[PDB]
Amino acid sequence: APGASIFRCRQCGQTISRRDWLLPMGGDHEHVVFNPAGMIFRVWCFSLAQGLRLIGAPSGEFSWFKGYDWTIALCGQCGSHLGWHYEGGSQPQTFFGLIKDRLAEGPA
The answer on whether 78 is annotated among ligand-binding residues is yes
In the complex, which residue's CB is closest to ligand EF2? 35
* CB nearer ligand EF2, residue 9 or residue 98: 98
CB-count exposure of residue 34 (10 Å: 0-12, 13-18, 19+):
exposed
Range in contact with ligand EF2 (rule: CB under 6 A) among 12-20, 47-55, 56-64, 87-95: 56-64
64 contact choice in ligand EF2, Zn ion, none (CB below 5 to 8 Å, kind-dependent): ligand EF2
Contacting range for ligand EF2; rule: CB under 6 A; set: 3-11, 18-26, 44-52, 62-70: 62-70
Cross-sheet strand order for the sheet of 69-75: 30-34, 40-46, 95-99, 81-87, 69-75, 52-59
- Our CB check for ligand EF2 shows the closer of 67 and 106 to be 67
Residue type, 3: G
